[PDB]
Write a protein that holds these residues in place. Structure first.
Motif, PDB file in Angstrom:
ATOM      1  N   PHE A 103       0.794  -1.222   0.000  1.00 48.12           N
ATOM      2  CA  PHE A 103       0.000   0.000   0.000  1.00 48.12           C
ATOM      3  C   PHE A 103       0.839   1.293   0.000  1.00 48.12           C
ATOM      4  CE2 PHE A 103      -3.528  -2.833   1.083  1.00 48.12           C
ATOM      5  CZ  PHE A 103      -4.613  -2.220   0.472  1.00 48.12           C
ATOM      6  N   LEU A 104       2.118   1.202   0.361  1.00 50.01           N
ATOM      7  CA  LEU A 104       2.961   2.408   0.433  1.00 50.01           C
ATOM      8  C   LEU A 104       2.932   3.253  -0.850  1.00 50.01           C
ATOM      9  CD1 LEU A 104       4.879   4.326   1.877  1.00 50.01           C
ATOM     10  CD2 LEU A 104       6.766   2.812   1.248  1.00 50.01           C
ATOM     11  N   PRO A 105       3.115   2.615  -2.024  1.00 54.05           N
ATOM     12  CA  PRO A 105       3.134   3.383  -3.276  1.00 54.05           C
ATOM     13  C   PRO A 105       1.845   4.168  -3.509  1.00 54.05           C
ATOM     14  CG  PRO A 105       3.957   1.164  -3.642  1.00 54.05           C
ATOM     15  CD  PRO A 105       3.379   1.183  -2.255  1.00 54.05           C
ATOM     16  N   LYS A 106       0.738   3.699  -2.946  1.00 57.57           N
ATOM     17  CA  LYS A 106      -0.537   4.395  -3.084  1.00 57.57           C
ATOM     18  C   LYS A 106      -0.778   5.417  -1.969  1.00 57.57           C
ATOM     19  CE  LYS A 106      -2.901   0.435  -5.204  1.00 57.57           C
ATOM     20  NZ  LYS A 106      -3.501   1.174  -6.349  1.00 57.57           N
ATOM     21  N   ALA A 107       0.060   5.393  -0.939  1.00 56.02           N
ATOM     22  CA  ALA A 107      -0.206   6.189   0.256  1.00 56.02           C
ATOM     23  C   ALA A 107       0.225   7.643   0.084  1.00 56.02           C
ATOM     24  CB  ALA A 107       0.476   5.576   1.464  1.00 56.02           C
ATOM     25  N   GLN A 108      -0.558   8.558   0.648  1.00 58.24           N
ATOM     26  CA  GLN A 108      -0.185   9.970   0.633  1.00 58.24           C
ATOM     27  C   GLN A 108       0.192  10.486   2.021  1.00 58.24           C
ATOM     28  OE1 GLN A 108       0.590  10.288  -2.695  1.00 58.24           O
ATOM     29  NE2 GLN A 108       0.037  12.429  -2.289  1.00 58.24           N
ATOM     30  N   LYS A 109       0.012   9.650   3.038  1.00 58.65           N
ATOM     31  CA  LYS A 109       0.192  10.100   4.414  1.00 58.65           C
ATOM     32  C   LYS A 109       0.665   8.937   5.272  1.00 58.65           C
ATOM     33  CE  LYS A 109      -2.323  13.263   7.442  1.00 58.65           C
ATOM     34  NZ  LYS A 109      -3.626  13.982   7.529  1.00 58.65           N
ATOM     35  N   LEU A 110       1.595   9.227   6.175  1.00 55.93           N
ATOM     36  CA  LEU A 110       2.094   8.238   7.123  1.00 55.93           C
ATOM     37  C   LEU A 110       1.884   8.758   8.540  1.00 55.93           C
ATOM     38  CD1 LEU A 110       5.563   7.287   5.507  1.00 55.93           C
ATOM     39  CD2 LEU A 110       3.295   6.367   4.972  1.00 55.93           C
TER      40      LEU A 110
END
Ligand SMILES: Nc1nc(=O)c2nc(CNc3ccc(C(=O)N[C@@H](CCC(=O)O)C(=O)O)cc3)cnc2[nH]1
Ligand SMILES: [Ca+2]
Ligand SMILES: [Cl-]
Ligand SMILES: [Cl-]
Ligand SMILES: [Cl-]
Length: 159
Positions: A103-110
């Protein structure tokens, strides 16, 4: 948008052979604050870890094997997991390792909690490049009567 929420010991360790060797109710409270009333996506190992459904959240389990609990939603692909979330402002991905990696590549926020613990890691958070992320919140805390280690909360937004 998709967001990941994780607790990282030193060297990005997120999971060990057994339960993590810390007691951080303040971190669990942060996790709850930031996931409540949002759908959460997790893998099967994390589902087992938690033990039961997370209250006040839609629980979605991404797994290739059929489901063994009727209180949560079982899906077999990333796209199915996202679809099951429906039309919401934010989807929270709560691990573990393989799920974060997908999911990281799709993520905009951590939403990251950095814990001052030196442990031998079984699984790790993905090797994100700090250069590509902007911290918009940071808050540091010492160990205390209820929390076993020092920890820092951070929210990153993709540059
Ligand atoms: N910041 C953060 N900390 C975590 O420990 C964490 N853990 C996982 C998955 N593991 C877990 C294990 C337990 C609970 C849990 O029991 N949370 C409760 C609050 C704890 C309590 O009330 O006793 C919840 O309602 O969210 C959540 C995630 C994924 N992201 C995380 N992210
Ligand atoms: Ca900043
Ligand atoms: Cl909090
Ligand atoms: Cl998992
Ligand atoms: Cl920054």
């Amino acid at each position: 948008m998709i967001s990941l929420i994780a607790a990282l010991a030193v060297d990005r360790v997120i999971g060990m052979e057994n339960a993590m060797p810390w007691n951080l109710p303040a971190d669990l409270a942060w996790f709850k604050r930031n996931t409540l009333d949002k759908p959460v996506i997790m893998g099967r190992h994390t589902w087992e870890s938690i033990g039961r459904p997370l209250p006040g959240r839609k629980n979605i389990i991404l797994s290739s094997q059929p489901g063994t609990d009727d209180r949560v939603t079982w899906v077999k692909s990333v796209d199915e997991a996202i679809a099951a979330c429906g039309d919401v402002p934010e989807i929270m991905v709560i691990g573990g390792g393989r799920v974060y990696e997908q999911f990281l590549p799709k993520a905009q926020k951590l939403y990251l909690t950095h814990i001052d613990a030196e442990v031998e890691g079984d699984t790790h958070f993905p090797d994100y490049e700090p250069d590509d992320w902007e911290s918009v919140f940071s808050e540091f805390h010492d160990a205390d009567a209820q929390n076993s280690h020092s920890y820092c909360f951070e929210i990153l937004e993709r540059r």
